[PDB]
């Protein structure tokens, strides 16, 4: 690896990518952020992993939290630190103040702490260190001048010592000054900023690497989530464009359609269903999950519009028994509101559900549902998200988008995703003689030939019936077409008088 | 209640942010869907005739079935029209029916079948020789049959 | 923050009434809405015919239209 | 016909029945004088009408 600084892996989902390999050995990273941002966890996880994966003991210096609690809380993610503190793989160093204390102690004890830590490290043979909340210490009676010289001592000696330290820091505003005394930012080799931006009452946490003296790293903010497994990051930009492509084809669940698509959809591909409300996207999706089951392959449906109940109701009335799909262990419906958490979260649930079920097909009914409230950029970023996972995992995907203006919409995107999509499916209304008929259309397929016809279609208990095209109509797309006839009566089956039978006999 | 109705959620959307509104909706929608309550909602499209969208803030999505009304300017007159736009679990009529309004209520008559561009409020009457083709004078190929 | 555990993240609108603080986790509520093929009239016969028998009971029907077309009526 | 003529219409009344046609009308020193609807025109609403001049049923 071409970098000039030897880094050490945190084993934290996404960090070592963002930090181009992890924290530089022998230096110190200032991970700081507001309140409830992830700070201590990040440090805890940092020590942990170095212990559960490299057998590198580590010293943890707590300043405000109690040595008991640090163990109490760590269990939340399933970590028995007590067991590690026991096996001497993790020494916790308690420097918390006292409930019956005096007043005055943050300088010579700083000369003492260095010596203290030097003992732990020397005794436990530690290779990693985490000082949590240094801030609280100066928080006795100090200003920027005593902070730059005092930290520095620590860091520096720690560096000589040869320990790869991590320091936490608090900071009032989310975007203003990195740290409190606005000084910790320059004494450190590396600075990591955790944020919990508000915006629209929801909450988006992000992690960012302002600086790594000596190497390069991923720039700007990257969204991470805190699960029962700790921090988890999405380098939604370190997502290289190197997924596999196969001319393989699969069923849509509608046979006349498969024709319209040069012989069925492509396996490695992104399918986009767009149409005004009530046209039938939802449907095509169903017949898509269904068929993936009628072929003994797994697939998941993530509904953000209708319930797991109602999704089954309309599915049966359309034929296809979803009840069984569930039992046969072939189809799984997720179902959830977009307002039940910001994108970063959703994007993960979806991934989650794709690793615990390994589907070979996946449907997301109404991406434009998730676009509720969210700023395009944030949506477009999430769209590249899902899309990007399903593309490097041989997991055909059918996204549904509902257009905000029926009849007369000049773009089947509204959010402008029509470039991420490999193949688009188009549904829309057609006012034909006072009636609201639907018609489908295959707008684009990257590798196939597909049918250029705008065939009309009708729905029955049976499904999407693909009929013929309005050859005798101008201004189709317009919603309310114009009738111009050169024929119509032309053959096809002229012969007048008695042509039919009735129900008795034929 | 066994049924619930809110006249003009568009009456609430006054002032308030879109997001708040959209949220409010889920806020009354889901509570109705779980509580076994059949609910009907009222929305006033800001522009009469031409309306390329049926709601405003884009609520349609959190809806099972749509019943819409839209004036149709016919022969110098402002008349009504209703149409079940979409129904998720049912069949429902595709045709756009006109309707009167008197002392007994609504009488959904026929759809303007001899018209074009109805969704636009101002249609294009197009009878000019109805479906009987230019063969209304049956050519005269029918001058063989009657003799003496 | 609730060190040690999880929790719902974001703001939630609560109302201080005559029954103390009331919060509405508008996101919490799940998408597990029971359903049935049960239909119900509207008050307009023909209308029910255009729907397919009537609006289902467990449903959300939206009556949209310009001002004056008769949503109130319906 | 190249002229800016008027029109009046009771768009909606909540109790009554009110007239459904768009009646033209002119202004004189005697005040408004409502007239007859443009029965034979199209796109009245838009403002820029279009006469149908439908050739009857063409006999
Ligand atoms: N299992 C878990 N699943 C989801 N979230 C969790 C879990 N455990 C803890 N959290 C969340 O992690 C956060 C805890 O933050 P942490 O104690 O690690 O340090 P901090 O917020 O950076 O600093 P401070 O000591 O000032 O709180 C809380 O906001 C909490 O909601
Ligand atoms: N049993 C049925 N028989 C005949 N037509 C049906 C039946 N169920 C639904 N339909 C038709 O299909 C439409 C329902 O649309 P669908 O459920 O496929 O999803 P959508 O239009 O993509 O999205 P959304 O319904 O959320 O707006 C109705 O508008 C209706 O015309
Ligand atoms: N007794 C009646 N006879 C004939 N027409 C009536 C009668 N009452 C009301 N109307 C008509 O019905 C319409 C009244 O609208 P309605 O009360 O149904 O509510 P809306 O159209 O949904 O909303 P809004 O009243 O604010 O426009 C009027 O436009 C009018 O033409
Ligand atoms: Mg905090
Ligand atoms: Mg902490
Ligand atoms: Mg749907
Ligand atoms: Mg919808
Ligand atoms: Mg009104
Ligand atoms: Mg009203």
Numbering used by the authors:
A (entry chain F): 14 to 519
B (entry chain A): 372 to 519
C (entry chain A): 224 to 297
D (entry chain B): 446 to 504
What does the paper say about this structure?
To analyze the phosphorylation patterns of KaiC P-site mutants and to visualize potential conformational variations in the vicinity of bound ATP and residues 432 and 431 at hexamer subunit interfaces, we determined crystal structures of the S. elongatus KaiC single mutants T432A (TSa), S431A (TaT), S431D (TdT), and T426N (nST) and the double mutants T426A/T432A (aSa) and S431A/T432E (Tae). b KaiC mutations xyz or mutants KaiCxyz are sequentially shown in order of sites x = 426, y = 431, and z = 432 where the wild-type residue is in upper case and mutated residues are shown in lower case, i.e. Tsa or KaiCTSa, where the residue at position 426 is T, the residue at position 431 is S, and the residue at position 432 is mutated to A. The crystal structures of the KaiCTaT and KaiCTae mutants are noteworthy in two respects. The structures of the Tae and TaT mutants reveal that T426 residues in some of the six subunits carry a phosphate group and call into question the common assumption of just two P-sites in the core clock protein. Among the structures of the six KaiC mutant proteins reported here, those of the TaT and Tae mutants are the most intriguing because they imply that T426 can be a third phosphorylation site. The observation of a phosphate at T426 in the crystals but not under other conditions, i.e. SDS-PAGE assays using heated KaiCTae samples or mass spectrometric analyses of wt-KaiC may indicate that phosphorylation at this site is labile. However, we believe that the conditions for growing KaiC crystals promote increased phosphorylation levels relative to protein isolated from in vitro cycling reactions or incubated with ATP at elevated temperatures. Therefore, phosphorylation at T426 seen in selected subunits of the Tae and TaT mutants is most likely not a crystallographic artifact. Rather the crystal structures have preserved a third P-site in KaiCII that appears to have evaded identification by other approaches.
The circadian clock of the cyanobacterium Synechococcus elongatus can be reconstituted in vitro by three proteins, KaiA, KaiB and KaiC. Homo-hexameric KaiC displays kinase, phosphatase and ATPase activities; KaiA enhances KaiC phosphorylation and KaiB antagonizes KaiA. Two phosphorylation sites (P-sites), T432 and S431 that are both located in the CII half were identified in KaiC.
